[PDB]
Amino acid sequence: GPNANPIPEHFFAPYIDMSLSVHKPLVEYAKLTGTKYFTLAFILYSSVYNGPAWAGSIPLEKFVDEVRELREIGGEVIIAFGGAVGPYLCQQASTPEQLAEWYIKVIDTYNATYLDFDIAAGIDADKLADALLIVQRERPWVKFSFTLPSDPGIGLAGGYGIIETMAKKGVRVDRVNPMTMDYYWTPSNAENAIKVAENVFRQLKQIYPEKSDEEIWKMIGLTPMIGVNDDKSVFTLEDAQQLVDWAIQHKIGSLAFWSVDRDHPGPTGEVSPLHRGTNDPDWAFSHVFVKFMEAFGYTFS
Ligand SMILES: CC(=O)N[C@@H]1[C@@H](O)[C@H](O[C@@H]2O[C@H](CO)[C@@H](O[C@@H]3O[C@H](CO)[C@@H](O[C@@H]4O[C@H](CO)[C@@H](O[C@@H]5O[C@H](CO)[C@@H](O)[C@H](O)[C@H]5NC(C)=O)[C@H](O)[C@H]4NC(C)=O)[C@H](O)[C@H]3NC(C)=O)[C@H](O)[C@H]2NC(C)=O)[C@@H](CO)O[C@H]1O
Ligand SMILES: [Mg+2]
Structure with missing residues (x-):
């Protein structure tokens, strides 16, 4: 389109924390990572602006030019709300209309x-669904993704109720993207991410029993935390390769990871937003995940 670009049927759009001082232009990340699709994180409620802002404090419009420049090379973005730290818009808003x-x-x-x-926090799912009914009516070309905590013994947790509510209310659910990380009782590896995927498959089949197996896998995305996780387990480059191969085999809709600015080597086992606490070279995880898109036609020089 004039400005907006197509996102591939099977896509890789890793998270960028837009608020970090290390932030590069999106076009530069595209060159370095090999993907021209990113999930931009996070919009939160700002008291100062009484509305949406990056990290709940940075002017909403700050990155408009960066997105325009990414679109010039055929790239595109997903805008993310929420994340580990509140306050969320859906928590602060008094009405679905607001x-x-x-x-x-x-x-x-x-x-x-x-x-x-x-x-990744308690919310009023009914209020969210009512707001999204308005959004999809007024902006019918916009797809909705739900990124939610997950665990290999259960799939989605309270997040499952959010999807159940969406489906019942008639809110479009284009993507369900479990965060395959930070279980604390078991390590963040490929085996456990695959168990999460299988559990989420069963969960979505219960909500949407009319959908084919292929339609369910197409709705699913997986998002690990690269290298050292907050719980000290390590999602290794080997895990990344195993998960990508599994994802290709199952023709799932998407992959992402936390996060672009963490795709650098760092001191062993140290948790940081600026590196991943492993010794893999710069952009190593990005390059593995890009193979997921390459299997299905993607090319970028
Ligand atoms: C099933 C279940 O209930 N499982 C839970 C499990 O959820 C709990 O762990 C939590 O998991 C969630 C995912 O479900 C984790 O959140 C993920 O993962 C990312 C990595 O932790 C997280 O990244 C953090 O995001 C922060 C913003 O939300 C970043 O804050 C930044 O801090 C900087 C200063 O340090 C500052 O300069 C920046 O401005 C600021 N940015 C913003 C936007 O405010 C923070 O840097 C970043 N951390 C790192 C290391 O990069 C993401 O928010 C989120 N990912 C996605 C894709 O959304 C969450 O972190 C887990 N928490 C903990 C404590 O492990 C688990 C533990 O409670 O219990 C299980 O049972
Ligand atoms: Mg919100």
């Missing part, structure tokens, strides 16, 4: 075609 207004302001500022609701 919430929808905020979401629509973000869509219109970025000409967004895909939003990601990264819900």
Whole structure:
């Protein structure tokens, strides 16, 4: 389209924490990582602006030019709300109407075609669904992704109720993206990410029993935390390769990871937003995950 670009059927759009001082232009990340699709994190409620802002404090419009430049090389973005630290727009908004207004302001500022609701805290799912009914009516070209905590013994946790609510209310659910990380009782590896995927498959089949197996896998994305996780387990480069091969075999919809600015070597086992606490060279995980898109037609020089 004039500005917005197509996202591939099978895509890799890793998270960038837009608020970090190390932040590079998106086009530069595209060159370094090999992917021209990113999930931009995170929009939160700012008291100062009484509305949406990066990290809940940085002007919403700050990155408009960067997105325009990425679109010049055929790239595209998913805008993410929420994450580990609040306050979320959906928590602060008093009505679904106010919430929808905020979401629509973000869509219109970025000409967004895909939003990601990264819900890792207690919320009022009914209010969210009511807001999203307004958003999809007013902006019917915008896809919705739900990124949620997960565990290999259960699949989605309370996040499952969010998807159940969406389905019942008639809110589009284009992507369900479990965060295959930080289990604390068992390590963040490929085997456990695959167990999460299988559990989420069963969960989505229970909500949408009319969907074919292929339709369910297409709805699923997986998002690990690269290298050292907060719980000290390590999602290794070997894990990355195993997960990518599994994801290709199952023709799932998407992969992402936390995070682009962490794809650098760092002191062993240290948790940082600026490196991954392993010795793999710069951009090593990015290059492995890009193979997921390459299997299905993607090329970028
Ligand atoms: C099933 C279940 O219930 N499982 C839970 C499990 O959820 C719990 O662990 C938590 O898991 C969630 C995912 O479910 C983790 O959140 C993920 O993972 C990312 C890595 O931890 C997380 O990255 C952090 O994001 C912060 C913002 O939200 C970043 O804050 C930044 O801090 C900087 C200063 O240090 C500052 O300069 C920046 O401005 C600031 N950025 C913003 C936007 O405010 C932070 O840097 C970053 N951390 C790192 C190391 O990079 C993401 O938010 C989120 N990922 C995605 C894709 O959304 C969460 O972190 C886990 N918490 C813990 C404590 O492990 C688990 C533990 O409670 O219990 C299980 O049972
Ligand atoms: Mg929100």
